[PDB]
Amino acid sequence: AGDSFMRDLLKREEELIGYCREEALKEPAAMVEAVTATVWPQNAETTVDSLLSQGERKLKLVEPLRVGDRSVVFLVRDVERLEDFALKVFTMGAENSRSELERLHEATFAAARLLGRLLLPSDAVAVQSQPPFAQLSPGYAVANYLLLMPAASVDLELLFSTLDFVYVFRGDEGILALHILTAQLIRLAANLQSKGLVHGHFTPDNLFIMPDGRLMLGDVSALWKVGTRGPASSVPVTYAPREFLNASTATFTHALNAWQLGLSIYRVWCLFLPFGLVTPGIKGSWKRPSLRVPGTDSLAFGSCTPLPDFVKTLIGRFLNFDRRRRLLPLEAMETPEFLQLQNEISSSLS
Ligand SMILES: Nc1ncnc2c1ncn2[C@@H]1O[C@H](COP(=O)(O)OP(=O)(O)OP(=O)(O)O)[C@@H](O)[C@H]1O
Ligand SMILES: [Mg+2]
Ligand SMILES: [Mg+2]
């Protein structure tokens, strides 16, 4: 800890992060406004039934936090436990949304039971007097299925867009934070590997710095035992290596997460993705939709924050296009480069 530095950094920039979080809610403000009124049509405090206990809970809106591709996540206060929670609400664009959410619920909580570094939901609730999972009234269709979980301080996607939106002088502290986040990402991916696990989206919208400064991975339903076959489409296309883009069914391998780790470290230092891949929310991004389509396939560091050579080497080995020759995170931790990374950090923190 390490973690402590990041905890303190996040606290000191709480106001800048809040500003950028508010800024990111403007393009999708239509969506946000409609969903808020669906869940809190009256006065900010809604009673819901738990789908796990048929206990009740009383949830007060504090503020919207983030919009996703298929959801809005709010900060809420459980007024009987005096604790804040993130609450994720799902939109129902997909024709089979209701069945998809019932499966997601069953899968998520069966996996969470088994387990008890992963950010897990602790409850799922539904507005009273309307059936669970069905479109929630008063109707941007929203499902009557609201997922309660610990609130992250920031997801990495927001951290990157915060770094991109406002130039802020951070001096040596900022550079140290880039080293620490790099080390934290490598240690989290190595923890997956040591357990023979692979996550389908080790991606910045699912990597979270919690209030204690620790990095966590969300969405347990997208964990796989290594070597398992599953739908390639479950990997976001800009974070998929070519071996995933080329099949309907793919094998979930450690090489996937080495690739995804390489992309996130590249974003820590560069904010946009490499290889010209489209990176919404970041100014420097090019517009290539995936590695399926031709483009520039060499690594470019010219527009990044200046990177240590040992970081460039690590990124380059994680992003080897040959899945057989791609460096894995546990082996990365035994390389001279990772040792230089650790020692840079240790000597700056002393
Ligand atoms: N527990 C949480 N605390 C804080 N922010 C969260 C939490 N869970 C999710 N978020 C953020 O909310 C946004 C939307 O969530 P997420 O990206 O998981 O959903 P999505 O985009 O709708 O679905 P998917 O990512 O699986 O396609 C993201 O910025 C994410 O990091
Ligand atoms: Mg997302
Ligand atoms: Mg998610």
For ligand 1, atom 9, name the residue with the nearest CA. Answer: 73
C-alpha distances (whole Å) from 17 to each of 2, 10, 150, 213, 272 are: 20, 8, 18, 15, 18
Domain ends where: 119, 151, 183? 151
Between helix 336-349 and helix 171-194 the angle, nearest 10°, is 130
What DSSP line would sit under 203-219, residue for residue? SGGGEEE-TTS-EEE--
Amino acid in the structure at residue 215: L
313 and 290 fall within a common domain:
yes
Q: What residue numbers bound the domain in which 267 lies?
A: 1-21+152-350
| CA 236 to ligand 1: nearest atom | 27
CA nearest 271: which of 20, 69, 1? 20
For ligand 1, atom 5, name the residue with the nearest CA. Answer: 152
What is the rounded CA–CA span in Å between residue 339 and residue 336? 5
C-alpha 102 to ligand 2 mean position (Å) = 19
First to last CA, the chain: 12
What is the rounded CA–CA span in Å between residue 311 and residue 301? 11
317 and 301 fall within a common domain:
yes
C-alpha 323 to ligand 2 mean position (Å) = 25
Q: Which two tokens stand for residue 85?
A: 């929670």
116 and 188 fall within a common domain:
no
For ligand 1, atom 27, name the residue with the nearest CA. Answer: 69
What residues contact residue 154 under an 8 Å CB cut-off, 6+ apart?
10, 17, 162, 208, 209
177 and 292 fall within a common domain:
yes
Contact 47, 193 (CB under 8 A): no
Measure the CA dihedral 66/98/106/121, to 10°.
Answer: 20
| CA 157 to ligand 1: nearest atom | 29
226 and 277 fall within a common domain:
yes
What is the rounded CA–CA span in Å between residue 193 and residue 258? 9
Domain ends where: 151, 172, 187? 151
Starting from the CA of residue 216, give the closest ligand: 1
Measure the CA dihedral 174/68/288/328, to 10°.
Answer: 60
Return the ∠ at Cα 176 (arms to 154 and 326), rounded to 5°: 80
| CA 204 to ligand 1: nearest atom | 31
Contact 329, 265 (CB under 8 A): no
Domain ends where: 117, 151, 185? 151
Phi, psi (deg, nearest 5) at residue 174:
-65, -40
**CB-based burial, 270-286: b 16+ in 10 Å, e otherwise:** bbbbbbbbebebbeebe
229 and 290 fall within a common domain:
yes
6 and 67 fall within a common domain:
no
Total domains in the chain come to 2
Contact 201, 102 (CB under 8 A): no
Contact 139, 50 (CB under 8 A): no
Amino acid in the structure at residue 326: R
Helix (H) or strand (E) holding 161: helix 156-165
Q: Assess whether the C-beta atom of 89 lies below 6 angstroms from ligand 1.
A: no
208 and 73 fall within a common domain:
no
Mutate which of 25, 88, 90, 118 to test ligand 1's pocket (most atoms within 8 Å of Cβ)? Answer: 88
What is the rounded CA–CA span in Å between residue 85 and residue 109? 17
C-alpha distances (whole Å) from 206 to each of 30, 89, 152 are: 24, 16, 10
Mutate which of 71, 101, 120 to test ligand 1's pocket (most atoms within 8 Å of Cβ)? Answer: 71
| Residue tagged 């809604």 (tokens) | 46
243 and 163 fall within a common domain:
yes
| CA 208 to ligand 1: nearest atom | 31
193 and 302 fall within a common domain:
yes
Q: Assess whether the C-beta atom of 230 lies below 6 angstroms from ligand 1.
A: no
What is the rounded CA–CA span in Å between residue 223 and residue 226? 9
